[model samples]
Target: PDKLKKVLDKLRLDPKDISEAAETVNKVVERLLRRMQKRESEFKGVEQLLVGSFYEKVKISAPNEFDVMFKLEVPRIELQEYYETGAFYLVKFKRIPRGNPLSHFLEGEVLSATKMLSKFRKIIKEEVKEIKDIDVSVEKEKPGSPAVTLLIRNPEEISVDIILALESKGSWPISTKEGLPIQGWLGTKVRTNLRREPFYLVPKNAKDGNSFQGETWRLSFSHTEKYILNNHGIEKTCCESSGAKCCRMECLMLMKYLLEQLKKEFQELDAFCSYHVKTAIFHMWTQDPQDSQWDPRNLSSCFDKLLAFFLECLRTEKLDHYFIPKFNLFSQELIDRKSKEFLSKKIEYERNNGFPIFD
Candidate 1:
């Protein structure tokens, strides 16, 4: 919990940060919404911004003949398809980033696969230009290529939604170049495929929760691997090595930040550990699809993979039994039995893999 509190400290969505300027933020949001609406209106078919707590769909282009989609990285305003041509009919947007609610008003995508992280940033800052290279397979083949080409049939019904957010990427060709973000991965987006398991390492002072690298890891496709195998996709047996960014340790180091911001009351080790373990474990496992699966059988699949993770946490271990989830839900006898079976299987697994762990 102490650890988890640290993350919340930086990302606190509470009113305090905005509380001082609640009314101001609200007004900024409103004015920005209006400006965005009028700007979108100038487009032949783009619709006005729809303000809602949920989400709004903005159609930047009307589907005419063959429609294009900004399906990969950040979208280019108008959908386009090119054949050894230029950005001829392509349309995109440029926005001013004022220090107000306008920044919060834009963010997210439920399904659009591409990204536009560096395009429309707020007021210019050295950090603002930090664009990352999202994996875009479509662009890979063409080398300066866009992701989609539309046989657009209808303009009015060309369904699309432009999500706005602080780190909005753009469709501009220049932005897609190296150093934008992500060294190597598939397709251009903050998040790529499951196998990638990519993570970021930000400075300790940076507000982004991600921080220094700390653990060793092997890429896990636990779920996706099975599906891909079943579907007869490419299988990787070697070439990739184990690795991970230092996010966990960084967060743990920052746990002290929580001492001030946490409202949930980490009043006791148990209270704190209770949420901390669950949150930490959930995050650790979720990073790899295999851990996301709750199978005791797979728990010990790797001799030290799980152990290393726990050790990383124990860096500052205290009598935080709360860190251990309540197994009381299961009788001790059942727990012991399961533990034995799992241990036995683990030994066999280790031997078969050509390594054996002895006490």
Candidate 2:
């Protein structure tokens, strides 16, 4: 238990470092957005939405990674599910006003995410060269990745992912009919209100050998996710000064840190990421919705239970996307069978032997 406490403390980020990193990154992002809106006609309506672990307050280790979604508002759009995944869609513009900049990137009835993303990357590259005082360069595009990664060298190295997303103001797609099972956890009213807000469509394609490779967009509920994590409690004031402190976020941080350490040790575990850890925690929260279950004094036990749930998922090779239940995050196409088995063994060893990797 003492070792667990020490490990968690080590994983915690320093407040000063966080402030410095955020300040530097925010300045860079602000400059980029200003240049983008002024120079590019298509990007004039672009707005930024900060997502990922940093903003969600679950970031472990250094605060060097950030995800900023550049949301472009579209006038009246329709979505068609790409194949049966229900997670990916082909966005179609409807009743688009004249002189809409997005029309230039349209292919037939569907909006071409590939074309839009390519133009966005080119503009960012062009504009990044003009910024002074800070050293930032656009990293090479990774195949199938949604973000245009930026590597910043301002004394300390920081990586930022600038994602291009379409902001759709309508009811969520029918695919998510059975998903986001948070009624028992965050209550029905919270869920309803969250659903009222607009959903985002990120420029993410389907897996390899698909016809809609670069044309498909994946649904993102990052804003809702951020809200849930920030206010995660059976009681309204779970982490407030006047309320009891729970170890829910701490457990997530520990899991993320554990996965980070394990990935460092094994190259085969590259497919795993922090989002998987978060999804597992959401499922665990729904199962055990009481704040008392996650008492800070019982951090070790709670973490063990979380680990047990994750192990069960790994062993069964089934981890569903929180918003899209049909999408199996551990599908063979994403993570191979051998890698899943290897990770399960490694995690079990760590659990039985007090996580030596953390030390």
Top candidate (lDDT): 2
Local distance difference test scores for all models: 0.25, 0.84
Candidate 1 lDDT (Cα, whole model)? 0.25
What are the C-alpha RMSDs, in order, of all predicted structures?
22.1, 2.1
TM-score of 1: 0.21
Tens digit per residue, CA lDDT, model 1, 112-204: 111222221121112212312211111111111221211111212121212222112322232112221211221234323332432111111
Distance from true position, residue 316, model 2, in Å? 2.1
Using TM-score as the measure, the top candidate is 2
lDDT of 2 by residue, 213-262 (tens): 77888888887887888889989989999999999988988898899889
Listed in order, each prediction's TM-score against the native is: 0.21, 0.95
Candidate 1 displacement at residue 201 in angstroms: 28
| Cα deviation of 79, candidate 1, in Å | 4.0
